[PDB]
Amino acid sequence: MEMEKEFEQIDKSGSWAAIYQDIRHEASDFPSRVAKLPKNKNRNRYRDVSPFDHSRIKLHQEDNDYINASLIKMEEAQRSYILTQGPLPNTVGHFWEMVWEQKSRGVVMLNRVMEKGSLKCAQYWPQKEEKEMIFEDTNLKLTLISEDIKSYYTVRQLELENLTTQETREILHFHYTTWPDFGVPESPASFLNFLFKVRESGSLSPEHGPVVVHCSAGIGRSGTFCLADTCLLLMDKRKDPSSVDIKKVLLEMRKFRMGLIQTADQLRFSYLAVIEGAKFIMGD
Numbered sequence: 001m002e003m004e005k006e007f008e009q010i011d012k013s014g015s016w017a018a019i020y021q022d023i024r025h026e027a028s029d030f031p032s033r034v035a036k037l038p039k040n041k042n043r044n045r046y047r048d049v050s051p052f053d054h055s056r057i058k059l060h061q062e063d064n065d066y067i068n069a070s071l072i073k074m075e076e077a078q079r080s081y082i083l084t085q086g087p088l089p090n091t092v093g094h095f096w097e098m099v100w101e102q103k104s105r106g107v108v109m110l111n112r113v114m115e116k117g118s119l120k121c122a123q124y125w126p127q128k129e130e131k132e133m134i135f136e137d138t139n140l141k142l143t144l145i146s147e148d149i150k151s152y153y154t155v156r157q158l159e160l161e162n163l164t165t166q167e168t169r170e171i172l173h174f175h176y177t178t179w180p181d182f183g184v185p186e187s188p189a190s191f192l193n194f195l196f197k198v199r200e201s202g203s204l205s206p207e208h209g210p211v212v213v214h215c216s217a218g219i220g221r222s223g224t225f226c227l228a229d230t231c232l233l234l235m236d237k238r239k240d241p242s243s244v245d246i247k248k249v250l251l252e253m254r255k256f257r258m259g260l261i262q263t264a265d266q267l268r269f270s271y272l273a274v275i276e277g278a279k280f281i282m283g284d
């Protein structure tokens with residue numbers, strides 16, 4: 001069923017809360033035993049948001065390999081994503097160790113450091129060129145190279161140095177700065193423009209490690225970003241673009257991380273983004 005007609009049918013019937021609970025009921029439940037070990041309590045932002053054991057990213061260290069991060073591998077679309085929480089005061093060094101070890105080119109940030117008067121993630125990148133950061137625990141140095149501030153997003157060029165080997169890499173930081181403190185954006189135009197800027201950079205392409213995507217918990221806004229990207233790529237690849245079922249794609253992605261799309265409003269917004277984005281994919 002053409003999702004645009006499914007959309008109007010749910011809107012006119014006002015059944016978004018009903019569709020959303022059906023997804024919550026059918027979603028996968030896999031163990032997260034490593035996340036719940038007592039040694040890892042200060043590595044988790046939220047007691048109720050944990051990576052599954054089968055899909056968790058492992059740090060390359062014998063001491064403690066744990067980070068709250070999941071590998072989402074979309075087989076038919078040929079896209080992979082790492083979804084992670086906003087870094088905590090004790091996990092900024094682990095965060096950049098993961099970027100280094102997984103060979104990522106891009107980091108996508110969908111939250112502000114402060115929202116609703118509370119801290120949603122640590123200031124984990126340098127704000128001035130002349131004031132770089134050194135993570136002693138993971139032996140990494142991070143330098144701000146350049147910053148391009150736009151009305152709806154900021155793009156930063158960062159240099160990450162492995163102080164052990166003196167290898168360096170360029171990382172691109174894509175920061176969506178205008179998601180409202182409550183609810184979802186009224187139009188998906190700025191969010192789709194932002195998704196197309198990340199794609200244009202090479203950060204989502206198979207010559208690099210997976211993109212790192214985060215918000216505060218790494219499931220809600222982060223879920224909307226990967227769901228919209230994957231659905232648009234499948235509409236490009238398939239003979240019948242109307243065969244793309246957003247609910248089935250979301251349940252596939254929930255095999256790899258719990259709780260993706262946190263509200264019925266985020267589910268409606270994901271449908272709107274895919275419907276409006278398809279009007280480019282199909283030749284406009």
Ligand SMILES: NC(=O)c1ccccc1N1CCCCC1
Nearest residue numbers: 089092093122123124133134135
């Ligand atoms: N070890 C670090 O993470 C670190 C290193 C250099 C400068 C700042 C740093 N952080 C920033 C956000 C979390 C608290 C402290």
